[PDB]
């Protein structure tokens, strides 16, 4: 019913435990991200909207998966 | 008995959620720090050693609590 980008294999493999695990862009906003909370053993998860600190924007790049300065973020709104 | 700098009142008041919360120096190493992971909802946490990026050292100063250039860090050495 709600938007839910939590990929099951990512949920099963990482258990969303590590510092970059199960973190996804929020389509509505560049200053938040979505973090998945596992609900069971088969990869289902509850998506949770999480805030970036003041001034920062989600950086979805491989190896990043963190809030970053806007000029380094993956916000689709640029220039 | 093993070393645990995680103070329960800080775990309780912050839930170790914020960007500077429940972060402590690692006495054994200037290139790592200790982060507290809560084990319950009533203040108990375990200490996890976390790495600084290569070449950086822990800065325990007030308002910092982050990995920093060596000349800015609080390393006792
Ligand atoms: C009892 C029990 O076990 N219960 C289980 C429970 O634990 C499980 O829940 C999971 O718990 C774990 C453990 O608490 C949670 O793990 C945490 O996850 C968050 C992310 O969600 C991690 O947060 C990241 O933290 C890293 C640092 O460790 C941050 O890295 C920093 O990023 C900044 C930029 O944002 C970098 O900044 C740059 O720095 C350079 C200089 O170095 C500077 O030049 C630049 O200017 C600067 N850029 C900017 C913009 O300032 C910085 O370098 C870097 N720091 C370092 C040291 O590299 C990163 O930003 C954080 N990311 C986000 C997002 O916040 C956190 O580390 C991690 N904790 C631990 C202890 O590892 C996990 O989230 C949680 N999962 C869930 C789903 O809740 C649950 C579920 O599995 O099960 C219970 O049973
Ligand atoms: C589903 C759910 O709810 N799960 C819960 C789970 O989320 C909870 O876990 C907690 O999650 C949160 C995120 O949600 C984690 O929060 C993160 O915490 C980390 C620290 O642990 C924060 O990391 C810092 O990030 C900032 C960027 O925002 C970094 O700041 C930069 O630091 C550099 C120095 O390293 C600064 O550069 C220096 O600047 C000075 C001054 O100008 C200059 O003099 C120096 O030369 C310069 N030095 C260098 C080397 O460049 C830079 O200015 C600054 N940037 C800015 C913009 O201020 C900082 O380095 C990072 N620190 C460390 C350490 O990595 C991170 O920001 C924060 N994320 C967010 C989104 O807030 C939290 O860690 C995690 N807790 C735990 C215990 O895992 C859990 C538990 O509560 O519960 C679940 O239920
Ligand atoms: Cl935004
Ligand atoms: Cl903001």
Author numbering:
A (entry chain A): 35 to 113
B (entry chain B): 35 to 111
Authors' description from the paper:
One of the better understood effectors is CfAvr4, a 135-residue effector protein from the tomato pathogen Cladosporium fulvum, which utilizes a carbohydrate-binding module of family 14 (CBM14) to bind chitin present in fungal cell walls and protect it from hydrolysis by plant-derived chitinases during infection. The majority of Avr4 homologs share a similar cysteine-spacing pattern and contain a distinctive CBM14 domain in their structure, indicating that members of the Avr4 effector family have a conserved role in binding and protecting chitin in fungal cell walls against chitinases. CBM14s are short modules of approximately 70 residues that bind explicitly to chitin, a long-chain polymer of β(1–4) linked N-acetylglucosamine (GlcNAc). Here we present the crystal structure in complex with chitohexaose of CfAvr4, a CBM14 lectin and the founding member of a fungal effector family that binds and protects chitin in fungal cell-walls from chitinases.
CfAvr4 bound in a 1:1 stoichiometric ratio with the (GlcNAc)6 ligand and the final structure of the CfAvr4-(GlcNAc)6 complex was solved at 1.95Å resolution, with R-factor and R-free values of 16.7% and 21.4%, respectively. The X-ray crystal structure of the CfAvr4 monomer spans residues Gln35-Thr113 and is composed of an N-terminal α-helix (H1), a distorted β-sandwich fold formed by a central β-sheet (A) with three anti-parallel β-strands (A1, A2, and A3), a small β-sheet (B) of two anti-parallel β-strands (B4 and B5), and a short C-terminal α-helix (H2). The structure clearly shows four disulfide bonds that match the previously determined disulfide pairs of Cys40-Cys70, Cys50-Cys56, Cys64-Cys109, and Cys86-Cys101. CfAvr4 was crystallized with (GlcNAc)6 as an asymmetric unit consisting of two CfAvr4 dimers, with each dimer respectively binding to two (GlcNAc)6 molecules. Each dimer consists of two CfAvr4 monomers bound to two parallel (GlcNAc)6 molecules stacked on top of each other. The dimeric assembly creates a 2-fold screw-like rotation of each monomer, such that both sugar and protein are rotated 180° and translated by one sugar unit to create a molecular sandwich that almost entirely encapsulates the parallel-stacked (GlcNAc)6 molecules within its structure. Surprisingly, the CfAvr4 dimer interface is completely mediated by carbohydrate interactions and no intermolecular protein-protein interactions are observed across the dimer, suggesting that dimerization is a consequence of ligand binding. Contrary to previous assessments, the chitin hexasaccharide is accommodated in a shallow trench across the longitudinal axis of CfAvr4 with the face of the pyranose rings binding to the protein by means of nonpolar and CH-π interactions, and the ring substituents pointing into the protein core and forming hydrogen bonds with both the main chain and side chains. The main facial interaction between CfAvr4 and (GlcNAc)6 is a CH-π bond between Trp100 and GlcNAc-5.
